[PDB]
Amino acid sequence: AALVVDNGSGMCKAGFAGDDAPRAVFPSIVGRPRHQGVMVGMGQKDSYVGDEAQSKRGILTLKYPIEHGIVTNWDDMEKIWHHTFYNELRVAPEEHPVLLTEAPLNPKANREKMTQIMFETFNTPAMYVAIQAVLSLYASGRTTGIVMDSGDGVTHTVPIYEGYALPHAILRLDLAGRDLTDYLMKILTERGYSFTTTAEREIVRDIKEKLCYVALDFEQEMATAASSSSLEKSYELPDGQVITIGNERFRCPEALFQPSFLGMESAGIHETTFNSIMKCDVDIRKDLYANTVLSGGTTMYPGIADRMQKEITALAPSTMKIKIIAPPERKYSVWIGGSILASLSTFQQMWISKQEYDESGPSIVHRKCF
Template sequence: MDPTSRPAVVIDNGTGYTKMGFAGNVEPCFILPTVVAANESFLSQPKSSLKGSWAAQHNAGVAADMDFFIGDEALAKSRSSSTYNLRYPIEHGQVEDWDAMERYWQQCVFNYLRCDPEDHYFLLTESPLTPPESREYTGEILFETFNVPGLYIAVNSVLALAAGYTTSKCEMTGVVVDVGDGATRVVPVAEGYVIASCIKSIPIAGKDVTLFIQQLMRERGENIPPEDSFDVARKVKEMYCYTCSDIVKEYNKHDKEPGKYIKQWKGVKPKTGAPYTCDVGYERFLGPEVFFNPEIYSNDFITSLPAVIDKCIQSAPIDTRRALYKNIVLSGGSTMFKDFGRRLQRDLKKIVDARVLANNARTGGEITSQPVEVNVVSHPVQKFAVWFGGSVLSSTPEFFASCRTKEEYEECGASICRTNPVFKGMY
């Protein structure tokens, strides 16, 4: 059967979580932590214990290759057995461990999606600053190991922009604010093309919010087992955190009505099974605040996210700036805090309006600048916006024509994966 008659497989590998599923769906089939637990006890045995024979050593290597888990299963295995080592293949949006990444894809395809890779075209995502060599490695693994008929490697920011449209016409000029677990990037896109020279990155992301919450709870002396403290902080972030409009007012609210605002976290100690409780207080609004006042968390980086977005747009070509301010799309799980988009729009509008006023004052009123429209787009699928954009993109007829095929790979080699055409099929 022709692979183009089947839905493409869409896999969005993020630093913290991987989203996977089939083209045409609204939601991914699985969302798993991007982590591999490999049983490396076979290979760490001394050669004498393997009787020194080649066969015994070879069998140990095969056993080590077969015995691994990914996602939540990997985390559970590492807790229950010391022979499993956790490996995080992606750091700050870039693949650092290709062996672990190949194992991860293997489990995604065969264990979770349960499909034959030879029967489906594949769409994978990458960070805007991924080096071309990385795309070659990806192409080699997909074409050689999995024997896929076609592959398209899409820039995640462009997909997020495609997911954020609110009308029948998809607007492909805008700024993507992608706040994931390991990286935060502000990426301007004009007519579907990334303006690479204007991309801004900031060293504060979802994991830093978790670490900050963990630090606040530890300093307050909450009764949380040390081995569980990071997981508890992550769950507190996902369940209770929100963005406030004014820190001082929020402190006063908590102090006046602690019963209303302070939540209780209940857990079980992993070693003894004894229950424990702890309070969740100021960290509910202080966690997300690190994006707007980073100085409360870090002395090294003190520029707020709205200021970084403004710098990014101001460095873009002048004829694109108004369109970029008008379409700022949120993407990634760490933008899901309540009122995050509203606060971002308010703070950014203040910066832009102050500049317009200053320019008008400088010219003495002879030349007046028109007000700049600032619009931050929040939408229901922003948590997995990149995956949803990939699902939309790979459902179009033009997708299959734009993919790199197995035949092209065999003829030209892995270098064909260095570039992928941007096509206008959906907008």
């Protein structure tokens, strides 16, 4: 068997090739206890990784080792990898090849260090490095389409017409859910609720996943919200306090299409789709219009596809038809596609050998993997 690990900005999954569901589901955060140990009865480990931290997240300094799809802290990163293989997946890395996924347009130092770690720390028999978004299209059973990946650190748009994607039309935007989490909280201060620390940030993360939704008409909906009622919902905080949120339910998800609220000049997520498809050939444009695919945990908002379809329709000429594909389980499409690719017999020749890494060092990843 071959192991599939898909490191994400906030959420990392792992499982086995051919499986329909990832085996391990825990967020990728390592925290260190700011307070001093008083009791000696228990272990009181130096650090905690994954679901272990969130259980005790009140007394930990939660840190995200990867930011915008870039591993800022390599010292913490191996802690997740060690935890994945021995605690969650409880398997020995030196018997099975493992595959890792990355966002496009990443620094060369990001994806050279992981190969060094894999062949020196865990001594995996083989390795592979594959773009995050391209694997999502495999999960949908298509090879000609454009994938709208939107996770926590990267929102990259890539058109894929054949078995390989076009690098020249890859547009990467650093606007994702984590920026959204930073955005509702500053707006949430308008209603009298203050959340500053990283511990309450996950509490902030929860409310977005449950109550935030995309409004079809932002101008009409805000006018509707001016009349009060019929939209405010009550949410219970882990403390026990119940909070009510009004217009902010749609305002934060709306920032995807109008980034002017967050203060960066890049256009909305609807607009960058149009730019990418302009950069490709005219003949391939027709196919990509009808094969638009959404992916990533950000795209989970209710009605996001309907508003997306409306926006691109205005920008696109009426001759070509736009069909947006939103599979129900697009949350794990990146991993699921990797399981299919790992299960393929043709892929036995695109593995990287340990001996081959020795001859070329960690620089072999640029030339072989893509």
